[PDB]
Amino acid sequence: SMADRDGKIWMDGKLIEWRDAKIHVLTHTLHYGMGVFEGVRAYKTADGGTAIFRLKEHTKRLLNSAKIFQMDVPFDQETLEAAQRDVVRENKLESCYLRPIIWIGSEKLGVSAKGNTIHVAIAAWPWGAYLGEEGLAKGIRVKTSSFTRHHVNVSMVRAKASGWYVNSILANQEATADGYDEALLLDVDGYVSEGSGENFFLVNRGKLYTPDLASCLDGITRDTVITLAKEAGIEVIEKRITRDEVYTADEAFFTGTAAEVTPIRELDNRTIGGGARGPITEKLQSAFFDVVNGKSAKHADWLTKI
């Protein structure tokens, strides 16, 4: 149980006991879905310390998400960054996942959010076993969802919002119920957008391709991989991608804070390339894990020591 645990949660300005982090059922966000959250990793680094990965960019996006919804957050970025470090430190955590969430309180329950408190909470918990290059060598099997990805003037897709993930859950459940590892979603035009919670990449003829920044979230892992790709001399192309363009690709993979860099060996029971992790995916995977493990000089400023 996530609720019944010893530990500390940061809530509305103070560290409180984990179990005391509670709200009433007539909370606006529970009923109407307007809330925003982040997903952030901390890694044990090669020198023995713990560092949060791209803390600044994640916290900037968190506040930008609230700003999209015109949610006045009673804390600045500097405060929230320190608070996230606090949560990791006081829970005696090393390799872990941080979940900041900002939501709308229980003062009034009309559609209008006007007059409700804007709450902020930050919790963290241990990550599972470290996978790395060795643990993420076998690709996963993906299914194209029959549910369509968010429309960009119905949902604000640059916001990492609570309400958006009903779509993700429906897509993810469709895939796993028929034995697949994850879903891949097409946008309203039938072009590949992203996974249920991950951005999508393919490789063809030594070049890295990814859907243009249209209906998908502006992933921080996505941005990380694109930067590492260019730095390694690999050309990156953003374009509209069809599903059969994926079927015929040399390699493919997912990126996300939780997913890191995860190879896709199969889509809709079409084997991707040779069916193993491809060489470009491997290269980017190693560049990625070198960065998050603090074995990279070029990107030291992406790690925040606890």
Add this chain to the structure above:
Amino acid sequence: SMADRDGKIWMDGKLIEWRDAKIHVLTHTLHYGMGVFEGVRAYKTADGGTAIFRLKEHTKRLLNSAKIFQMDVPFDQETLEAAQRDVVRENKLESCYLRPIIWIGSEKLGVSAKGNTIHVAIAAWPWGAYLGEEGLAKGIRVKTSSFTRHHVNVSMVRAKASGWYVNSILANQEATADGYDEALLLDVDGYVSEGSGENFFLVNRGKLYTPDLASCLDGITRDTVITLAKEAGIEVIEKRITRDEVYTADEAFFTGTAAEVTPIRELDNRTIGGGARGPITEKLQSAFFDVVNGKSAKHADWLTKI
């Protein structure tokens, strides 16, 4: 405050004290938006009694919403109907708004959503006219939103789901920030769909028009008004409606449990007809209120005495 009140809330099989109806901040629905709810009204009827309006139909829709999401609800329809009546009775309410809500608990916080408790809670409180008393009698000013209504293969629009209402909030806030009473949303094709929390009707040449049951919710108030219109010998036509078709209509109005029957006297600063409450609207509105107040011989079974 909705949290800080005296009274009883029905939750997971029993009446608890109002303030005790709490959840952890790591509740699945708070983060990922998959929950379902209903809006139901109890009315003080002409005989001095209290009666819930179309309880069965609302409870049926609540379980169907959960069914669409494959959420297993640990209570059947008969139990939930009785629970709603219990809430109204034990809180000694003469008239109220009921809010049943079904959500996903705090046992685990992945998108993968497996193994979480399916919670159910029912609260009720006194709540006046959603769009105001002056609105009911004189009509309101409405603004066509620049936010687009839900796409039917992205959101499951037949389910009244928590996550869906980010879109309603964005639209409603856009309208009210510029001084309008409510928003009207167009679907992805540019046709009138509905209000942020209301089904939409217009009147033209003595006939009642409403958008076909496409991108909009299958409103129970909507269904009520259509039945009353047919019983009054008024022809009802379901079609695709353009915004300038509304600009030139004889009358227009909103329907919903909270909004009841609210006239629209103006859309996008274009006066609707004569600019007041039109004769067919007033006719349907009065017929509606005669039903909920228990003054009609034809629809007694739409009312459940407490």
Add this chain to the structure above:
Amino acid sequence: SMADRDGKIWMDGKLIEWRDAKIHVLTHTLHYGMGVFEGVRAYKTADGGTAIFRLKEHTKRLLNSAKIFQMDVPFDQETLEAAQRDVVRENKLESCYLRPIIWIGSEKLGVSAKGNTIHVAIAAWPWGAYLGEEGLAKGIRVKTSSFTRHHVNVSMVRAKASGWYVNSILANQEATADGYDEALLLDVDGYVSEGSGENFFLVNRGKLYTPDLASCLDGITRDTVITLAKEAGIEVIEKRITRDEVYTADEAFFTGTAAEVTPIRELDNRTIGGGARGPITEKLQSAFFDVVNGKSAKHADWLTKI
């Protein structure tokens, strides 16, 4: 040259000599397309008199077109109805086409549209069969346009507006350039909408079909024919029509004030039915001309004597 004529034109409150009806080249509507107009016919009736067909309905739509654009017209409906009768009378026309137009003057030439005079002019001239006397009896050859019909949230399709007809010109010119009589336009979804300046009907298995009132103008001739069809015991169905649904139709025809009721005997070089004017088209065509010629007692109220 329709500028160089003898006669009277009603302009801004009074009858003036035809040639004096002039405007400056820095007229707002000339540059920015926002103006509204009507097409109205006066017929020689069987009693030797002249009557305008559905004057009230056309003048109502004209003012509603202005209302859609929030153009404040300096004259009421009674005044404009009389003025149109005045124009027919003072030009000694036994039968004619009336062109009322409302436009935005030359006081200021920004998009700001603020403070310009709202002008109104009415001219009239003899005008025979828009698509030919032969076309009326034998039917015409139509080409589906490669230009798409107006989107209903880009253009306000219920307004008969100046700026809309660029689309009609492009479609019409495409058809006639390759030797066809008229163009047929599909909407943004690829369903049949209407002709470049006519509503569309088809007949199949003794029933009359027409596109639903979606992206097409609410034609008065369209309404006229629908009514006459119902009165003739013919079932009328409004639906989304595909182009190959027309190819395989028993009959098809156009309606409009200029086009009256014009049979379509061929679409995209597919012969419609037998290839001439079909029986149900002929019955509806004859019912139509009986009405405008004042041989029909049931619809005398549709005719206004000069």
Add this chain to the structure above:
Amino acid sequence: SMADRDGKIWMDGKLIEWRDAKIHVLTHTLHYGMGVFEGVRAYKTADGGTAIFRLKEHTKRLLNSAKIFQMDVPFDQETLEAAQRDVVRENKLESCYLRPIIWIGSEKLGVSAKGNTIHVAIAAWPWGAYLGEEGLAKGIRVKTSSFTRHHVNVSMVRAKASGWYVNSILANQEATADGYDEALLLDVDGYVSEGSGENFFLVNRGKLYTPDLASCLDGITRDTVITLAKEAGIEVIEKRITRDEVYTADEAFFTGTAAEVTPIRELDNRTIGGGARGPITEKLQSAFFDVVNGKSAKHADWLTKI
């Protein structure tokens, strides 16, 4: 009044008196919207002279607009360039605005433009005070319109045509009626296209972004700014932009002949960046005004001395 002035207007081959530039009300373009126009600025340059900005490019676009409509213009580019200079010179103008317009005459008033004279007129009038960098230091407040931008197979959006601006007026009136400075329009897919009469740019992470050349007009100010940006070493990216991508941008601005380079400090009541003019926008403003004032070494060929 634009009509009642002393001056000279070039019309159909020669300078005539301003007030004599008249046409009949039965002019085809007044009724049907197919006409094309340009907006061109002349600036007082640093050496005391007066020069038209990108006259050749504007006149090329004027003739291309007519060519798109298959309007045979009875004058070549060289003649029209000389006439525009003639109009500035003979009206004794310095800083001013030129308005060339090509339209369809009054020989026949069917939807068919066949047989009608193709007219050309050029007028010009003084500009208000020079704003420059200092005068355009305040960003404006923009509202996303509830009206959708032109469909590229319904309207020919590369043509600057009379009929297109009904949509612009509707969007602009919607914004200004609620107290905003200008409208921003989304295309039929919900992506930012442009302002009602201006192209749109945003800045993020030191890079310049703009909607790809899809549903928007190929603005000459847009082209000017893109070129200056590249010459200043600024990366220019063309992509599909969402409205919340604007909400979260560092800077944004409009470009247009009249608007020059105008910063945007707010969209839909979301503050853009810090709410002031950004450093990139200022740099591009400076480069732009250095060019139009004739103080640029690289782009003298963009100015035509009167």
Add this chain to the structure above:
Amino acid sequence: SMADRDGKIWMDGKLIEWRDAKIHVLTHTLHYGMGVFEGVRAYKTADGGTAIFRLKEHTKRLLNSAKIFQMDVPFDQETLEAAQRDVVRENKLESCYLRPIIWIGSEKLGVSAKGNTIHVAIAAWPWGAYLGEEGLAKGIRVKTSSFTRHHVNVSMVRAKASGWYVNSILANQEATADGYDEALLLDVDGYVSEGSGENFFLVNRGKLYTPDLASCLDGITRDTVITLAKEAGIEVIEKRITRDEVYTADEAFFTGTAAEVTPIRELDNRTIGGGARGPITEKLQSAFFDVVNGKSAKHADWLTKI
């Protein structure tokens, strides 16, 4: 094998031995997909005889399919009807499936189809329940496909054309590969259109619902069922249907010549109603089989004895 068997096939005017009905690999339709076919059943009637169900309507549609493609068929409807009867007779079949097919021959292999032979062949064989015999009585499990149903201005969906069924194969293969019985396809807007080879119906609150005749084939079984429904006093409604509208329907079923009337007990692992063949479905299914077996006098003219 379908090729290797004893019997007779009608091909291009004459009955030939089954195995002799061959064509060259360089056959136009084989490479370019433009061919048309039909599915027709003969049943063993209750009097011992054999009758083809709705031969006239199927043969009319066959020629209309050809007409849509402008394929000149060298045989009239009378001849093809007789040919089909001969095929059933000369193969001594008491009950069977007829497959007429019209295709473009091997004279030329450019895209430009001109100058090729238009071939016609008619074969027949005994064929059981298309979706299984157990499915007819107990209902089948259906999966919403991730492939989108034909666009009505890309494909001519009223023609039963060879090339259209790549889409059907892709959807059907997707469903069967994961253990479902058949696929359900949504149109380009996300609404339920039809199965991969079946029209679709749902039942709710005593009424019969089916997608409007938009992107789906004008099914003859669909038409049969609608007629029988109306004759049974069951109200029939054509509308746009969402997938979650199916999830919450009382009943659902497929119709087609091969599939006859097939109940749907489950869609996307959501149980439909009580999870069995519903009462209305049962009533319409029995009405259907009574008609095709010649046990109903009302529709004798739908049967053609061999």
Add this chain to the structure above:
Amino acid sequence: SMADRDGKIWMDGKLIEWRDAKIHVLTHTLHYGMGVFEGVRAYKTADGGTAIFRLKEHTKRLLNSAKIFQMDVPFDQETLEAAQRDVVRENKLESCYLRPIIWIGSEKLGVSAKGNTIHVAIAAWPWGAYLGEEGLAKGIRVKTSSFTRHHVNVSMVRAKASGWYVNSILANQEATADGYDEALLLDVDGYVSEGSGENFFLVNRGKLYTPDLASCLDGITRDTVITLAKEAGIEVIEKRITRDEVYTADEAFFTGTAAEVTPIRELDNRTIGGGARGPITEKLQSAFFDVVNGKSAKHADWLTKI
């Protein structure tokens, strides 16, 4: 006749006599459209020899097309490449058009392709310029089709599939029936996609434009021309292109195996630039024919000697 010829056809593993390459009319692909094919040319090279142009890429794409449809091809790429060379050699062809085709056999004729034999055949014949020799030199006249290009989630557009060409035939017939040389198709959004059997390019201000790889085939000739353009120092830009963007372009041309590099001098009766073959088109066309004729050392590896 394509059937009645002397020579050898490679079919299912061996060369057979041309006329013996036969299939049964009850072949799955003939009825349901799922098959894939290629177009490949052998050129008489400058040394008097004969070479297939980019045999590897075409054969790679052939198998990728099969892979998209999950068609298990009983031969590998090495075998198919050698077979194509065999067909040219044994037929004693100096230059020719090669047509490899993979289709689904005649074991079963249900929608389900499981489990029919996957057949492969390869024929070759002399074939001149697809769009004419004069067309290659002076450019052709093109008409924009009123038929819309394939939707990327209805058809798998990266597969060169038999079923896809009903659309091409319909577009191409529409163009030629009215005296044009070829059709140009817009995608479902109104943007230019490609010819009926050709990729599309335009030239503007020294730069080369082509629609992005979205709804069109990933043509190999397209790829070749892009590569040659970059080697010649010409910038290549991929973007969304409107039809009026073509109207106003400096040059335009088609590419394809059959069509080679064919200039377009006219679209929709708008002259493209000078009305003749433009300089950039001539340079690229010349560079192309240099490569396929074996006159260029840079791309010898694209040629496979028979």
